[PDB]
Ligand binder design. Structure first.
Ligand SMILES: *[C@@H](O)[C@H](C[C@@H]1CCNC1=O)NC(=O)[C@H](CC(C)C)NC(=O)OCc1ccccc1
Ligand SMILES: *[C@H](O)[C@H](C[C@@H]1CCNC1=O)NC(=O)[C@H](CC(C)C)NC(=O)OCc1ccccc1
Lengths: 299, 299
């Protein structure tokens, strides 16, 4: 199995650059609105504890330089929604895809189009960790890069990049500017809470192994969801939700292995280890493939 | 630090679907020519042992059904270059990027845009293995998907997909239709030569681990180039040349670790194992990042 990003072309056509002062970051141009991180209006003196409301009252439309490549888009209105700035421009983007703004859950994956100065640089898959960070690859100038899923030509934007944490992982908002996790857009020392293993994704990976004929770990036990969740927490695994059980439905049907039976299999792996055996050619259990990713790659 | 693919938009606009008889696969539309694998002309019986020139002379232009999105393109001519068919169409692709056709070297990387029925499905990074296979993610109908690199807006196409070996690795051609490796577009179970590990890429990846603040594998020892190559060859690694040492220059200069010092690190890792530890989250030595890949991502 491979981490497979979505084709990025529909998002590439939406990337612009936004400069305020000497700060340039990326923005997302959909119809006649450009979305970008609000900290673009900050100066080096403002970043430690910015007063965003007061900083925005001092700004005008003519303070914002929005460029598609080197072509300026005239700004005709501006507002702030949570942690994102919305700049109304005088041109509707003709490359706007069908799209939706979505807030994802921990465990869900998405493609990131890493951008600099409005120019796309690369694309890769990320998983939202239970502590609401992602292991991205972002350098200076990457803020405003977005993460997305594509379903039948509709782009669901779920992530806009804002910051790096001391441990090297990353944090950001949805496209309504609401941070994932307990982070704030200040230049302050923030620490990711203790992370956990994404149980629903590990189960998806065990289903993927079974589909491919690797099923030594299928055992003779079952469990209740509550009994499993209590054991999972003792191994730093996430508890399963009702939604998790349901999204494992298609893989359970495809293999004929009930979800709670697979849970009992993983429970044995957690209490006894792998004993030098592998699963899908790996000694480690993979937790960044969702049940959709497994189906997507096997279809 | 992640495996990062190039943004795929410039290639997406080039993908079309090619149908001949009962066979459907993808084609690459540049200017007024569509490139696709020639085994599209084969039927279920032809494929075991096809005489392609004989099969192709018996085809007409109207035997080829080319679809770009919903619109039909009309084939007004056709020729064959090695294992690739060149279908001349009456419309120029308006989305043709600046492009070149290149034959890539073993150890080099490229991005694959996996397509089905002419529609892009996913994007991911691959390396050309020393045995001229690629470890990809390809299903039925993925033939004609292409691999590429992008440099300053110029797409360099290096790979077109043709088949999957029984081991699950993949084989294809350059855009001139010549296979990478000893493979042939016939429906037979084919084996590759023994694969080896791309040593220069393992070293680049160890340097990436240090740029990202990881050092558990470093040691105080050093080695000569020839002594390293003796151990490398013993573990089925490719030889390291002086040109490789030079190409690793920037990564050594950035981290202040001499190339031959890092070779002594890898020698130790090869002779001791990783001992249950991980490097950049991996439990195995990674050889699909080139020195350029590491540089581009890290700076
Ligand atoms: C967006 O331009 C930038 C993304 C950082 C740059 C280095 N890697 C990243 O992901 N965001 C910030 O620099 C962000 C801005 C406000 C939230 C204050 N601040 C931040 O991430 O603090 C940590 C940091 C700053 C500069 C370099 C490295 C880490
Ligand atoms: C192209 O659409 C298709 C590629 C994929 C790769 C994954 N599974 C696929 O089907 N190519 C073929 O089907 C190819 C056709 C030949 C005429 C080149 N055949 C092939 O991959 O067969 C491999 C094979 C043949 C006999 C025994 C075992 C394997």
């Amino acid at each position: 199995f491979r981490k497979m990003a979505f084709p990025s072309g529909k998002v590439e056509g939406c990337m612009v650059q936004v400069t305020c002062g000497t700060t340039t970051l990326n923005g997302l141009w959909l119809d006649d609105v450009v979305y970008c991180p609000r900290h673009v209006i900050c100066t080096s003196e403002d970043i430690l504890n910015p007063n965003y409301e007061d900083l925005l009252i001092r700004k005008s439309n003519h303070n914002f330089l929005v460029q598609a490549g080197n072509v300026q888009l005239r700004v005709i209105g501006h507002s702030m929604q949570n942690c994102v700035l919305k700049l109304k421009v005088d041109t509707a983007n003709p490359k706007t895809p069908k799209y939706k703004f979505v807030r994802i859950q921990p465990g869900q994956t998405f493609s990131v189009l890493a951008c600099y100065n409005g120019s796309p640089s690369g694309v890769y898959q990320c998983a939202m960790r239970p502590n609401f960070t992602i292991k991205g690859s972002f350098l200076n100038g990457s803020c405003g890069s977005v993460g997305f899923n594509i379903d039948y030509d509709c782009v669901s934007f779920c992530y806009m990049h804002h910051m790096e944490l001391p441990t090297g992982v990353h944090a950001g908002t949805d496209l309504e500017g609401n941070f994932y996790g307990p982070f704030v857009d200040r230049q302050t020392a923030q620490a990711a809470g203790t992370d956990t293993t994404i149980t629903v994704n590990v189960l998806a990976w065990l289903y993927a192994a079974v589909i491919n004929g690797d099923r030594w770990f299928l055992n003779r036990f079952t469990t209740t969801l509550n009994d499993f969740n209590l054991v999972a927490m003792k191994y730093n695994y996430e508890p399963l939700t009702q939604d998790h059980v349901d999204i494992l439905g298609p893989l359970s049907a495809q293999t004929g292995i009930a979800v709670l039976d697979m849970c009992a299999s993983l429970k044995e792996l957690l209490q006894n280890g792998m004993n030098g055996r592998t699963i899908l050619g790996s000694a480690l259990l993979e937790d960044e493939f969702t049940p959709f990713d497994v189906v997507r790659q096997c279809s």
